[PDB]
From Swiss-Prot:
Positions of the Protein kinase domain: 15-268
Amino-acid positions noted as binding ATP in the UniProt annotation, renumbered to this chain: 43
UniProt family annotation: Belongs to the protein kinase superfamily. Tyr protein kinase family. CSF-1/PDGF receptor subfamily.
Effect noted on mutating residue 43 to M: Loss of enzyme activity
Subcellular location: Cell junction; Endoplasmic reticulum; Cell membrane
Designated name of the protein: Vascular endothelial growth factor receptor 2
Domain notes: The second and third Ig-like C2-type (immunoglobulin-like) domains are sufficient for VEGFC binding.
């Protein structure tokens, strides 16, 4: 893959590094044509990285360039790659952090839908929010899958909350997100990402709970998963959303929905939910 320096290269002295999130928060001067000073996130190699470790982050940068822009994938802004300092990959900064942590903090601030007076539920999460986060991640994953990309670590911890309830796919016990074929055969495909998406759905509709609550992650866990045991419906799910999780958790990878099918399905459930809400709002 190519690296186009004229488009992407950013001077190192235009950054002020801040607190670690290695991924670090930073201030960037003149990275945009939209503003002078902007907060950003920087991924860089620690002191004493090898030639091969340098190649890994470089290949990741090129892949982000090749992938291109989507609202639901953390947006690359620039890079420091030329000699004189460490390799640095610069993206937008999502100040609200990961989705798991956020959902966990909203557990006392949930109603399934809003009615009048709406101020009683100011900044509350609703079913529209949860389905909307799901829909957004599905679209970002359909964008990635279309470009022959496999995420490999799709989990709520790798979903970022931005302004105006926009979520973004990023890449910061992992076994609880892995498909059976990934565990037992070390096979990574787009279909195994769909499995992980299902576990991500469970996380959203449990408001940031840890998958397989109270289950020891040993050889018995893997045995039962391969043999068809699944998580039970989480506390904030709808019946259709739980069925969607089960679909993502199909034993045969080819029998799981595609991200394209998930985008259409979740979009329809978002619309049905909104139509329901408008009726709740009207009659009360
Ligand atoms: C800084 C950076 C650089 C690269 N990537 C990255 C690497 C590989 C893949 C991807 C993906 F999945 F978005 F395509 C993204 C990143 O996800 C990030 C990244 C990581 C954590 C972040 N956390 C916050 N709060 N904001 C932005 C972040 C960016």
């Amino acid at each position: 893959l190519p690296y186009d320096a004229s488009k992407w290269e950013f001077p190192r002295d235009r950054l002020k590094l801040g607190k670690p999130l290695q991924v670090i928060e930073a201030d960037a001067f003149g990275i945009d044509k939209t503003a002078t000073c902007r907060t950003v996130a920087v991924k860089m190699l620690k002191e004493g990285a090898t030639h091969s470790e340098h190649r890994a982050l470089m290949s990741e940068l090129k892949i982000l360039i090749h992938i291109g822009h989507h609202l639901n994938v953390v947006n690359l802004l620039g890079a420091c790659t030329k000699p004189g300092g460490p390799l640095m990959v610069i993206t937008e900064f999502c100040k609200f952090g990961n989705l798991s942590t956020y959902l966990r903090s909203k557990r006392n601030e949930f109603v399934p839908y809003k009615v009048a007076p709406e101020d009683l539920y100011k900044d509350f999460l609703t079913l529209e929010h949860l389905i909307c986060y799901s829909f957004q991640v599905a679209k970002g994953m359909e964008f990635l899958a279309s470009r022959k990309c496999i995420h490999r670590d799709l989990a709520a911890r790798n979903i970022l909350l931005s302004e105006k309830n926009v979520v973004k796919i990023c890449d910061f016990l992992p076994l609880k997100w892995m498909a059976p074929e990934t565990i037992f055969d070390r096979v990574y495909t787009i279909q195994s990402d769909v499995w992980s998406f299902g576990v991500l759905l469970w996380e959203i509709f449990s408001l940031g709970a840890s998958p397989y609550p109270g289950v020891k992650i040993d050889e018995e866990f893997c045995r039962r998963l391969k043999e068809g045991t699944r998580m039970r419906a989480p506390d904030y799910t709808t019946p259709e959303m739980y069925q969607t999780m089960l679909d993502c958790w199909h034993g045969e990878p080819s029998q799981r929905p595609t991200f394209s099918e998930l985008v259409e399905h979740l979009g329809n459930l978002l619309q049905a939910n909104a139509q329901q809400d408008r009726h709740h709002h009207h009659h009360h």
